[PDB]
Enzyme design. Sequence first.
Site, PDB file in Angstrom:
ATOM      1  N   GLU A   1     -84.468  48.914 -60.199  1.00 46.42           N
ATOM      2  CA  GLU A   1     -84.044  50.255 -60.254  1.00 46.42           C
ATOM      3  C   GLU A   1     -82.801  50.165 -61.221  1.00 46.42           C
ATOM      4  OE1 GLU A   1     -84.408  49.959 -55.524  1.00 46.42           O
ATOM      5  OE2 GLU A   1     -83.149  51.712 -56.382  1.00 46.42           O
TER       6      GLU A   1
ATOM      7  N   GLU B   1     -80.794  61.685 -55.600  1.00 50.10           N
ATOM      8  CA  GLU B   1     -80.657  61.507 -53.992  1.00 50.10           C
ATOM      9  C   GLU B   1     -79.178  61.431 -53.763  1.00 50.10           C
ATOM     10  OE1 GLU B   1     -81.534  57.145 -53.487  1.00 50.10           O
ATOM     11  OE2 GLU B   1     -80.820  57.302 -51.260  1.00 50.10           O
TER      12      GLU B   1
END
Length: 336
Positions: A141, A250
């Site tokens: 990530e 997010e």
Amino acid sequence: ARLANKPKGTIKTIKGDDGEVVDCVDIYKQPAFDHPLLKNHTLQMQPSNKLEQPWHKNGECPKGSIPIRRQVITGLPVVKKQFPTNHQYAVIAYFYGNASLQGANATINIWEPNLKNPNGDFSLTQIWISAGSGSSLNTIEAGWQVYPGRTGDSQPRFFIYWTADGYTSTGCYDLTCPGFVQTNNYYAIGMALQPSVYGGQQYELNESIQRDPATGNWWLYLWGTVVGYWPASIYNSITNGADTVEWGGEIYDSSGTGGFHTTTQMGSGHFPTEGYGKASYVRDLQCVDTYGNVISPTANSFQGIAPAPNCYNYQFQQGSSELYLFYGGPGCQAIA
Ligand SMILES: *[C@@H]1O[C@H](CO[C@@H]2O[C@@H](C)[C@@H](O)[C@@H](O)[C@@H]2O)[C@@H](O[C@@H]2O[C@H](CO)[C@@H](O)[C@H](O)[C@H]2NC(C)=O)[C@H](O)[C@H]1NC(C)=O
Ligand SMILES: *[C@@H]1O[C@H](CO)[C@@H](O[C@@H]2O[C@H](CO)[C@@H](O)[C@H](O)[C@H]2NC(C)=O)[C@H](O)[C@H]1NC(C)=O
């Protein structure tokens, strides 16, 4: 509130004018080499490099060392990372049929979204490159995040993350645990990024992640410059390639409304229909197949993940040269 202790192998410490602290740690003594599965200490120097940051005005790390940002201990909790109850998303997912994707790109528009509850909330935009499921889920990530509880302030900061067991007991942010191997002498992970201006100047975070076919190591490139790699030895399901790539935003709602009733912002804090310069986007939505070909999936090839569309959502826009994913929003107003 307080700075963490200097890590082992710190050769020199550079204090930035704004309070940032950088430890020049000997490349062979960086946290990655404390990993039990990284007994195979051979440092891959290059895949088979100057990046400028404001702290360079106060000094540079000597050769043979890497700049590591000193952690800020706020005294506030840092919640568990989660793959796309109080987390909300506006993400697109590209599901491959097998774990053989050899890389992925993401050029992420940078913003400083506002947090309704700064002591507990977060807002981020990133790429998720994964393989496996449940206890075997492996992730790679990278992106930007506003998380005062973790970082100490409300600026969008570059971050990396990884897990080898679906976030149960492995993985961490940046170089806070043994995992990612940093090779770049100039660029410190975890520093502030320049946020875009509403109706004005747009800033991007270009990141490219590529698996080295000779070693299995997953290399990170920022704006085409090597930063380091996630070793194959820390993983199991993603060692030969990835089966899934996801892009987008997010938020974490510490108020407990499930992300359905908070004005914590995603992207720029403006819905994707406001467009270029107003809403945040992700472009360079590409991955690499088993045979080294760069593939650019069409808008219909992705699956959307936006569980609170009235608060945060996404919209595709066909540019003149490539596909754009606009995403984010202002959240939903709390009921009184
Ligand atoms: C490994 O998977 C690839 C890709 O999977 C397909 O494409 C994904 C985007 C997703 O939609 C999957 O469900 C699909 O199955 C397979 O590549 C395909 O190969 C066939 C020939 O066998 C070809 O006609 C297709 O065009 C290919 N698709 C793509 C997108 O490349 C590949 O066959 C799988 N490998 C094995 C050994 O099963
Ligand atoms: C998108 O991903 C591709 C594939 O990883 C990147 O392509 C590499 O780019 C470098 C620099 O141009 C080349 O030297 C390599 O030969 C390329 N590899 C392949 C397989 O094409 C590309 O750079 C990425 N683009 C962005 C903007 O991140």
